């Protein structure tokens, strides 16, 4: 499974020392490109993309997002006038990209949002822009009259796939790498309750299975997971907690399942 | 790998 | 308007003398106008790097703040998060042994 995702944001209040327009690209959930309204240029974020792309590619990419920046700049005023709003903090969000699944076939998407709520979504099957809100009917009329659907469905099904197929090939080692996590368990006694915490430090890829084991048997009672949180170097972190009786700290163990480990690693105090 | 047609973002 | 979900953690397992990186990740919030600061005993930390700021499938924003540091005994490390959803600055303390 391989995914390509391009997300854009048009802000009214960023606010101090921050750009109003931010555009970023993703390959299998990894940041590879960045664009901001202050610098006005598309920059590489990973080593595999910069070593495999020329300046002529980035000059072409900069021109595209520069035109997209001015369209989203106009969208902030058009939507404010339509909703009859005067000033304040308003946002325009764009979600575009394609996904390659295990037959499976191709899944393409192009959807927008205003003030964190769904506005419009493109349906490649019917070749029409679906309006989610009653204020999205004037958007549907102007978008379909422009004839964008004819070129957008060809992009999401062929061009988007063609770009993603080579991006995976460029960083095949950078995406297929394995990093072993540093697992450490801790115990803290509160108001007559012993809270045990298990943390995994710097693992790659993102999928991980972390569970608790009391006296050899897996116990999910009073268990809380903080999900998968990213680090500044590309690796991932996870935090799991369990509420137990005081003095029963030695009974509990942390079961960690990852691609880097051939067998599940059991960790104790 | 952005789409050439940036007009598809019009609202 | 949605409230931010904040988590404070270190890159490597906490140990005095050894170099580490303090992280502060906020997610599930709207609007994107957020103020995140890494602090050492109330004083803002030096050499702090801010994320490019992305958003999830449910349109909710996310930002990560990381800074290179050496954990010292007696010092209290915390993260200050300011948002329009809260009428008070939320302080999330980092525990080296939890
Ligand atoms: Ca062309």
UniProtKB/TrEMBL annotation, chain A:
GO CC terms of this entry: MHC class I protein complex
The Ig-like domain, residue ranges: 181-260
Annotated compartments: Membrane
Record's protein name: MHC class I alpha chain 2
An example Gene Ontology biological process: antigen processing and presentation of peptide antigen via MHC class I
Family the entry assigns: Belongs to the MHC class I family.
Claim: Signal is one of the keywords in the record: yes
UniProt key word Glycoprotein: yes
Membrane topology designation: Single-pass type I membrane protein
Disulfide bonds: 98-160, 198-254
Record key words, sorted: Disulfide bond, Glycoprotein, Immunity, Membrane, MHC I, Signal, Transmembrane, Transmembrane helix
Protein's organism: Gallus gallus
Whole-protein coverage range: 23 to 291 of 355
Name of the gene encoding the protein in the UniProt record: BFIV21
């Amino acid at each position: 499974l391989h995914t390509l995702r391009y997300i854009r944001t048009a802000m009214t209040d960023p606010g101090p020392g921050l750009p109003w327009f931010v555009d970023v690209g993703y390959v299998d959930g990894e940041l590879f490109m960045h664009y901001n309204s202050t610098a006005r240029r598309a920059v590489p974020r990973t080593e595999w993309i910069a070593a495999n792309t020329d300046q002529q590619y980035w000059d072409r990419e900069t021109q595209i997002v520069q035109g997209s920046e001015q369209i989203n700049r106009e969208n902030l005023d058009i939507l404010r006038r339509r909703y009859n709003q005067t000033g304040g903090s308003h946002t325009v969000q764009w979600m575009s990209g394609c996904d390659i699944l295990e037959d499976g076939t191709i899944r393409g998407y192009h959807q927008a949002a205003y003030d964190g709520r769904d506005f419009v979504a493109f349906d490649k099957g019917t070749m029409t822009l679906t309006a989610a809100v009653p204020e999205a009917v004037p958007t549907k009329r102007k978008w379909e009259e422009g004839g964008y659907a004819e070129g957008l469905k060809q992009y999401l099904e062929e061009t988007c796939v063609e770009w993603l197929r080579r991006y995976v090939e460029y960083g095949k080692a950078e995406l297929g790498r394995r990093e072993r996590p540093e697992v450490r368990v801790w115990g803290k006694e509160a108001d007559g309750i012993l809270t045990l915490s298990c943390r995994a430090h710097g693992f790659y890829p993102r999928p991980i299975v972390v569970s608790w084991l009391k006296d050899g048997a897996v116990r999910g009672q009073d268990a809380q997971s903080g999900g998968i949180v990213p680090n500044g170097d590309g690796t991932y972190h996870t935090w799991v907690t369990i509420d137990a009786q005081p003095g029963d700290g030695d009974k509990y163990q942390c079961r960690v399942e990852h691609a880097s480990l051939p067998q599940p690693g059991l960790y104790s105090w | 790998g952005h789409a050439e047609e940036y007009g598809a973002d019009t609202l | 308007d949605l409230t931010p979900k904040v988590q404070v953690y270190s890159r490597f397992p906490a140990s005095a003398g050894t170099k580490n990186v303090l992280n502060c990740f906020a997610a599930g919030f709207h609007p994107p106008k957020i103020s995140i600061t890494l602090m050492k005993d109330g004083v803002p930390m030096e050499g702090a790097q801010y994320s490019d700021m992305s958003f999830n499938d449910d349109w909710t924003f996310q930002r990560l703040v990381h800074a290179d540091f050496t954990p010292s005994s007696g010092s209290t490390y915390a993260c200050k998060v300011e948002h329009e959803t809260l009428k008070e600055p939320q302080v999330y303390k980092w525990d080296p042994e939890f």
